[PDB]
Amino acid sequence: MNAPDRFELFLLGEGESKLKIDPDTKAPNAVVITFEKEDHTLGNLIRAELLNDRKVLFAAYKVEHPFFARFKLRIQTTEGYDPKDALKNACNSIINKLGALKTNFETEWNLQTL
Amino acid sequence: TLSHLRRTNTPIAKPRQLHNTHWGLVCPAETPEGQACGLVKNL
Amino acid sequence: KAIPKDQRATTPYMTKYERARILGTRALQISMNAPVFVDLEGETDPLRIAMKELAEKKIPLVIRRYLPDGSFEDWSVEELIVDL
Amino acid sequence: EEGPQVKIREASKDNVDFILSNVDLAMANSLRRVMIAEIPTLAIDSVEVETNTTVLADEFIAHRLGLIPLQSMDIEQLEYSRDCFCEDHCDKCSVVLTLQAFGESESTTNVYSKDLVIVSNLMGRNIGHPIIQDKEGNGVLICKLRKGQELKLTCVAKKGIAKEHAKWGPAAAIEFEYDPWNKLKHTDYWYEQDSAKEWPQSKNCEYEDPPNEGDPFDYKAQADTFYMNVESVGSIPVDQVVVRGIDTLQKKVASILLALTQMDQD
Amino acid sequence: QNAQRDAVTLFCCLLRSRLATRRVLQEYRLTKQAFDWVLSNIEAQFLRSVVHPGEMVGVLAAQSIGEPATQMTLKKVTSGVPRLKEILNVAKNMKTPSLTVY
Amino acid sequence: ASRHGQKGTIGITYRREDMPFTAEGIVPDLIINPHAIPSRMTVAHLIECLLSKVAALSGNEGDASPFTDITVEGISKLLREHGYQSRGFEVMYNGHTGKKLMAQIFFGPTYYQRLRHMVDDKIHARARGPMQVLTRQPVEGRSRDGGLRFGEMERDCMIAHGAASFLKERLMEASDAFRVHICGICGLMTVIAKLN
Amino acid sequence: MIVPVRCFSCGKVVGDKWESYLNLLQEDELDEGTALSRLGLKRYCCRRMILTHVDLIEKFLRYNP
Amino acid sequence: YDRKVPSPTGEYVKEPEWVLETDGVNLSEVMTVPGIDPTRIYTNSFIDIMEVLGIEAGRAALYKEVYNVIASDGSYVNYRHMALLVDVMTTQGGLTSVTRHGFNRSNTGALMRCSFEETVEILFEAGASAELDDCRGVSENVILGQMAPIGTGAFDVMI
Amino acid sequence: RGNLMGKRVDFSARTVISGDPNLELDQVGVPKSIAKTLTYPEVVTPYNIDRLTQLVRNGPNEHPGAKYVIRDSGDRIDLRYSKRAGDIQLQYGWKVERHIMDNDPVLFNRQPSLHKMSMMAHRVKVIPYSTFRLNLSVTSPYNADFDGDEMNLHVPQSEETRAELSQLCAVPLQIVSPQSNKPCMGIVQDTLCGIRKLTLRDTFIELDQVLNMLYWVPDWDGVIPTPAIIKPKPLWSGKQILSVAIPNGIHLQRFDEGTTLLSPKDNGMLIIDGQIIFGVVEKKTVGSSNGGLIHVVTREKGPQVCAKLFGNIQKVVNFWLLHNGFSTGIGDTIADGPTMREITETIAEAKKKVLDVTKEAQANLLTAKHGMTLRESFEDNVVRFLNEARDKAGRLAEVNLKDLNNVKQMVMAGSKGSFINIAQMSACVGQQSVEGKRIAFGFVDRTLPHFSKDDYSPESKGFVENSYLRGLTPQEFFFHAMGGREGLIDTAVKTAETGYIQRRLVKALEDIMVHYDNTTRNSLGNVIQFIYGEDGMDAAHIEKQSLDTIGGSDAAFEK
Amino acid sequence: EGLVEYIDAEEEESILIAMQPEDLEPAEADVDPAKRIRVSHHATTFTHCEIHPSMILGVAASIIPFPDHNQSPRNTYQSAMGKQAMGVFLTNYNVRMDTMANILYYPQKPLGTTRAMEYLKFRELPAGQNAIVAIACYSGY
Amino acid sequence: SNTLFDDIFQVSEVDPGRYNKVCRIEAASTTQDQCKLTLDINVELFPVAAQDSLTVTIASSLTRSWRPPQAGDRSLADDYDYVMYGTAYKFEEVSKDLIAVYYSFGGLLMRLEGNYRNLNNLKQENAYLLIRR
RNA sequence: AUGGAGAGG
Ligand SMILES: Nc1nc2c(ncn2[C@@H]2O[C@H](COP(=O)(O)CP(=O)(O)OP(=O)(O)O)[C@@H](O)[C@H]2O)c(=O)[nH]1
Ligand SMILES: [Mg+2]
Ligand SMILES: [Mg+2]
Ligand SMILES: [Zn+2]
Ligand SMILES: [Zn+2]
Ligand SMILES: [Zn+2]
């Protein structure tokens, strides 16, 4: 009766960009991206992979309220390394592990019985 | 429903206290709280 | 009759009830687009303005403090200290 | 092959017990989530009812209809109705099916999901057929009729995501376990006298080496191996729940990549 | 001026007991530009701490006694709610009169 | 509410994925706080849980009849032959993150009951609306689209705060403000104000 | 009312299991735990969906209309 | 009873005394008794303390009592409140109860008293005695729907 | 009383309330449907006309919009049914009754309204779903839980009337309360239970987890603090990141018992400028105590910073706790084998001791304590012997509960539960009691028809030997029920009587205020106090400092 | 056949009731440390024997599992709330025209029961479902 | 700057005070007879038996946010085994010829007792306590 | 509008 529709978790709305990038005012060379219509599924995956990049000083995400499918990613990189690239290499890195994971699973499946 | 058919009313010196003699006739536990506590009873 | 401006016995400080009623009254004046005596800076909120308009002592209201006997001390919002 | 590593232990129409070596915890988790809420499926999502003189209420039935697992193998070539340019539904984006039941007998007439009859044009796509793992071939007991009772209704199956309703959930259960000797000290075992004698041994302990008291705490170690078991309802074969899961996760990681390029424009 | 000296008495005991020379210099080790501040604050903080005229201070007192009285529920004397009810009623005939003799 | 005076309302809904989970994929339908347990001494709730889990596994009916020789020990031995840890604990994994839980969770079946008290049946707000004839104040009751009552106990609370204009407003512009005419002499509302 | 289209907890489909359950009981004299196991209802989250279920429909059909 | 008292050497110490506790009260006569410290004798009956030792000793006793109700319950209310309560019962001259017999006689605004207890009988002989109402009581302005002289309404604003 | 001292009123709302780990203290979750019904008359002015026009545009559905409009003549234009709802050109000086929006000031209430902190101005945040939401830490002044309680909300109509709420009634400026000169809001339940969990000397956090916690506090400077542990791994102590929540220049010292500045038991507390130095953080620090964090931070940094402080602590502890987890089984009410056998034999040596005294008093060798009947002494002794038995077996049990025992840990944190709870659940429930005495003889000379007459034994008069864990027997059950009922009956009756005392109190001190001569008076101007409280101070700004002239050797005073 | 009598409160006054049949001797005449502590048959002069102690309870408390392991007022609260639980209040609900009627979609016979539940028909007309439930602090919601 | 203090201690007492990741340690200096040490040690990281002997140093370097361990090329300033960073909170005077310092490494505690030490120790903020074996 | 019954915190 006051409930939001359930598509509102994955469907974007009236002029809501998927990513929103803002210059962090606190620490230098840091940025805080807002991910509309996403959750711990994404955020935890991006933040954990950003932690493997050794030119990333800081990386953490957070769902400010569970009512809303959205989350903030905060990223700080070493001087000269633009944080967006830190995000880009991060995503790609995941995609490559995932692909390898898929094929590796397939070949394993193609060897079974029942 | 089952309950409401086996109810007791008691209008108006210690009428609310679950009294010894109630053993086996009235339920120790089942009674309204607040105003009618211990006055309304269930068999 | 009234009381002398010297020999004013009450607190030279502004009571919290004086402040709320002052901010209230100005924000009501601001609300109905009466003239505004500050820079604004982008404050479009009638209460936030009177707050800035008070911080700069530019509020031209006077307080009439009542004493239990019918006496009364007048204080300008100009002169009342605002430490709260 | 290269990175993350799979090792089936058991496989079946309904289950894949495997081991997922060389992966982040985060990824092995994010995969299980996706497997639960984000691989799309077809399921009844509208019921127009013509007659229901049955003991049950309209929507009460309508509800169960939603829960009946429909074949979703070729789902990727059906469309989201919200997407498709037709008004309401069509044949590109929605399967329509019919249910007719009338009690003839004296005995109670049952209504199964076998009694569901596809009507719209599947056009070759492997879609919409109610899953039936039942042994006598009538999976799921929709409703029961007395003598004069009738039930006549029409259901439009749509492509949906379990995030939106748990009907469109391809996964049933997704067993999941790492470090079966707490060698990472990720829990602190509650006990009374003895952690070891009181907590039972995970079946995944024949697969790892028990720690030695002669050894101290390995603090550098991370979570590496993962023992999952995906069980499927059947609207998608098992192997596919995991694959499409990895596919979808990857797919949505990607739209983030693309979205970064979309912003760069002047 | 006598009311004023009175009101302030107990506080100043605390003031003089702590802002006494031996202590300022041997326990704290304060200075001048810093000790003048400590004086300054205390002045300001104090002036703040005064109650503001026009404070409905009765309703405040009644509520401040009433509310925790609603949290009273359970050997000699009558205590708690019944006792309170005796007190405010000026019970001519109370339930546990007693003398305490020294 | 469970069967033992542990009542309480929903605060949020989480979908399976965000829920904590057992290592066999079991997930709760329901999460109650451990703080409802130790001050209300409803140990029964705790035992019913333990018995119920055994009943489910064993496929028997848990006898929770009162005065008998059933025993948290006896039940616990039974649940142990069923391979789970004997006091109802189970390692659970956080759903957000996939990491284990430091703590093990008391987890099992427990007969819970939905009570006639629903949110959508209580909700009510009113801006301005009906006004009784006699007093010209807001009518009483949600079912009547009425105003909530600013009681004396509320009136005092405003008085405490020192909110004078608010207290006036509550008792004038909401509710029943009204304009009469008096006489410069008598002082009664006697005047025949032939307005206009 | 009537069997559940699916288990609330896990999501498994327990709706096709009802008749088969009732048969395992009475036809070949099995006990409910064994019966529930043969139906491959292993985890107790979906095991109680069947055991704890009551078929009130059988009563509802009793009424003529 | 245990008792803290100053040592010959300055520090405070535990020097436990003997104390007599009573069922019943006749303060008038047990304090005049030889053998006891008549400077420290006490009843829980502040109603007698008021009679024997005077209105101000009573006020102090009435507080001591009220205080003890709270603190025995674990609680702790600040002294200014209970004091105001006490002092209010007390300023009339004796013990003024918090009932229609107590404060609700005290010649305050007629409209004010009619808002508690005897509602009409107050309004009636206020009509007969032809009373005049200051209208500086809170509850009178509540009735009149005017801003009450409370806090923000305790003064006047001008230019 | 029904239509004058109190009147039904417009612009009001009510619903079931629920808690929210993510609202800020002074906020109030308002369901959209309510936001859309309640109005504020906002006057058209150059500063607002853009937003104001847009609102009328958005009509009355859905938020944020507006219902009606008020023209110069004072007519009432209705956005619902109007052939001009589309194109209306707002004149300066017109009223636009808009919806209630974010950061509107609204008076929030729960009845019975006992003290002022039961009507506090909150900041509106419109949310989905049908319940009012508040921060758990505003729970207490409201006495509100989430087992079905409803709360009211009133919306101010004028510019001043909103001032009056935000300047006088706002939740931050009620945090420290003149009632008990202390804070009336603190860290409760989960947050409380976990904050102790988080700060044990065993509690370390590795990098990944630290950065989330860090990012979780909004007021974070974005400076990773140097990890307490570096070689050969960075573990960050619980105490360390929690400190991020606490502001600067916040000094705190607490010596609780064996506290000796090495805190071999992590006792007491010590916060040297916004960093905690030693000691487990629990109720005595972050509760609503007297010389605790909330009292300090309010006075030191102001209400605003303190109100902000509530959020930050909950945001971190909750996050940390969410991935640590906490639970309670029946395993937490099992005492050792050994401890059980001792508990039983303990109960017996008191059953054997009552036996004697009874045997003794039956031989007429019992001597009545001065000023009491022979029987009175006998009861008094037996009741003491059995009470002692309980407390003794309780403590017996409490000692056997480990530190990982969950019931213990809530008692440790101070979250919920106490000794008796542990005692009765695990060892022995104790002696039942009605009207102050043990269970009477309802039937002649006996207590139930299953006893022989004249049976003063402990079991016969209502001593529940067993524990809740073990299980009360028939007679035990029945007696326990008898006592239990008394509870209910006078709980019911305590609510009745209290509610009268209050009304009376209030009506008697109603018109007492401090006038502009510091002289507490009343409608007649009668002096009640000559200086408010005998010292002129407001009770909020007052704390318990020791006057250390008073104590010690004359010698050391001199020194 | 005089095997069973009817006693009212007054005649109850004049008799000696045993709580357990075996309490007769029987004849008596090492233990489980986990069972509750039971006094003995110390009165060897009975006249009647309680049918079964659980019958002291009414219709609502007869629904509570293990009520003899609960603080007594909680048992009372349940007894109030059970009357507000939704479920199948009668099988003929489709043919009645009540102002307000609530029926549970999938009611469930509780996993832990009471012998007295049998005569109360609770297993056949339940009101409550057997939720899988965790006691845990999770999101703090 | 440079070093602050360095000695070699012998462990006399190790104490799991109802803990399993921390011990309160008691050591004396094998050089000064007027010198003992009390220290809270993460024994799950760097275990410490009784009768051990541990080289102990107090240095203040190697504040800006802690970059991860990019010591790949930097100057670790250690080659020790165990290293915490604490705060100095109390400096205590035991005897005209004795002085004690009080450290808090994230609530792990340290008490050092000696006399010439006074000519080195600062009142925070820094102080990396390094231990070897 | 009366009057009444049950229930919520
Ligand atoms: N003034 C009144 N308040 C009541 C009344 N009945 C309930 N309440 C209120 O409900 C609040 C809590 O009481 P509950 O309804 O939760 C019953 P109880 O005290 O047994 O709950 P627990 O605190 O869990 O022990 C109490 O503080 C009151 O504000 C009543 O008749 N009058
Ligand atoms: Mg309560
Ligand atoms: Mg409540
Ligand atoms: Zn289409
Ligand atoms: Zn006239
Ligand atoms: Zn299931």
Short mmCIF file of N, CA, C and O in Angstrom, two decimals, chain E residues 5-33:
data_model
loop_
_atom_site.label_atom_id
_atom_site.label_comp_id
_atom_site.label_asym_id
_atom_site.label_seq_id
_atom_site.Cartn_x
_atom_site.Cartn_y
_atom_site.Cartn_z
N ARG E 5 25.61 36.24 46.47
CA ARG E 5 26.75 35.62 47.11
C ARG E 5 26.36 34.22 47.60
O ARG E 5 27.15 33.28 47.47
N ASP E 6 25.14 34.09 48.10
CA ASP E 6 24.62 32.81 48.59
C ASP E 6 24.55 31.73 47.50
O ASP E 6 25.17 30.67 47.64
N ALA E 7 23.79 32.01 46.44
CA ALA E 7 23.62 31.11 45.27
C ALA E 7 24.91 30.44 44.79
O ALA E 7 24.93 29.31 44.29
N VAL E 8 26.00 31.17 44.97
CA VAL E 8 27.25 30.91 44.30
C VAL E 8 28.21 30.16 45.22
O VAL E 8 29.14 29.49 44.74
N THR E 9 27.94 30.25 46.52
CA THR E 9 28.75 29.65 47.57
C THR E 9 29.31 28.26 47.29
O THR E 9 30.53 28.07 47.26
N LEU E 10 28.42 27.30 47.09
CA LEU E 10 28.84 25.90 46.98
C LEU E 10 29.77 25.75 45.77
O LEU E 10 30.83 25.13 45.89
N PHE E 11 29.39 26.34 44.64
CA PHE E 11 30.23 26.30 43.43
C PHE E 11 31.67 26.81 43.66
O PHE E 11 32.65 26.19 43.20
N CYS E 12 31.78 27.92 44.38
CA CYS E 12 33.07 28.52 44.62
C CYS E 12 33.93 27.65 45.48
O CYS E 12 35.13 27.67 45.32
N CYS E 13 33.33 26.91 46.42
CA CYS E 13 34.12 25.93 47.15
C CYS E 13 34.82 25.04 46.15
O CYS E 13 36.01 24.76 46.27
N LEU E 14 34.09 24.59 45.13
CA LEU E 14 34.72 23.74 44.14
C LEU E 14 35.77 24.55 43.40
O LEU E 14 36.87 24.06 43.11
N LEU E 15 35.42 25.79 43.10
CA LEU E 15 36.33 26.70 42.40
C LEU E 15 37.66 26.93 43.13
O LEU E 15 38.74 26.73 42.56
N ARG E 16 37.58 27.33 44.39
CA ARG E 16 38.77 27.56 45.21
C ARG E 16 39.50 26.28 45.55
O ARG E 16 40.68 26.32 45.85
N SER E 17 38.85 25.13 45.52
CA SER E 17 39.54 23.91 45.95
C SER E 17 40.45 23.41 44.86
O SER E 17 41.34 22.61 45.11
N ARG E 18 40.18 23.88 43.65
CA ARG E 18 40.78 23.34 42.43
C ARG E 18 41.67 24.41 41.81
O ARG E 18 42.67 24.11 41.15
N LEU E 19 41.26 25.67 42.01
CA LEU E 19 42.01 26.81 41.48
C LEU E 19 42.83 27.45 42.58
O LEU E 19 42.96 28.68 42.65
N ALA E 20 43.37 26.59 43.45
CA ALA E 20 44.18 27.04 44.55
C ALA E 20 45.63 26.87 44.14
O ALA E 20 46.00 25.85 43.52
N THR E 21 46.44 27.86 44.52
CA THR E 21 47.79 28.10 44.01
C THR E 21 48.74 26.90 43.98
O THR E 21 49.41 26.67 42.98
N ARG E 22 48.82 26.17 45.09
CA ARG E 22 49.71 25.03 45.20
C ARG E 22 49.41 24.03 44.11
O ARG E 22 50.30 23.35 43.59
N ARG E 23 48.13 23.97 43.77
CA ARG E 23 47.59 22.93 42.92
C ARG E 23 47.73 23.31 41.44
O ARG E 23 48.25 22.54 40.63
N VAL E 24 47.28 24.52 41.12
CA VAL E 24 47.48 25.11 39.80
C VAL E 24 48.92 24.94 39.31
O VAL E 24 49.14 24.60 38.16
N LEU E 25 49.88 25.15 40.21
CA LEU E 25 51.29 25.14 39.86
C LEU E 25 51.99 23.80 40.06
O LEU E 25 53.03 23.56 39.45
N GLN E 26 51.45 22.92 40.90
CA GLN E 26 52.18 21.69 41.17
C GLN E 26 51.47 20.43 40.69
O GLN E 26 52.12 19.41 40.46
N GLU E 27 50.15 20.51 40.55
CA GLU E 27 49.37 19.37 40.10
C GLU E 27 49.06 19.47 38.61
O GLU E 27 49.09 18.47 37.90
N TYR E 28 48.76 20.68 38.15
CA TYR E 28 48.44 20.91 36.75
C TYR E 28 49.66 21.43 35.99
O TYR E 28 49.97 20.96 34.90
N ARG E 29 50.35 22.40 36.58
CA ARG E 29 51.52 23.00 35.96
C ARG E 29 51.11 24.06 34.95
O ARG E 29 51.80 24.29 33.96
N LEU E 30 49.97 24.70 35.20
CA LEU E 30 49.42 25.68 34.28
C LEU E 30 50.32 26.90 34.11
O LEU E 30 51.34 27.03 34.80
N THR E 31 49.95 27.78 33.19
CA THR E 31 50.71 28.99 32.92
C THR E 31 49.81 30.22 33.04
O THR E 31 48.86 30.23 33.82
N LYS E 32 50.12 31.26 32.26
CA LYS E 32 49.35 32.49 32.30
C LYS E 32 48.33 32.56 31.17
O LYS E 32 47.12 32.53 31.41
N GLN E 33 48.82 32.67 29.94
CA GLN E 33 47.96 32.75 28.77
C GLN E 33 47.01 31.56 28.72
O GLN E 33 45.96 31.62 28.08
#
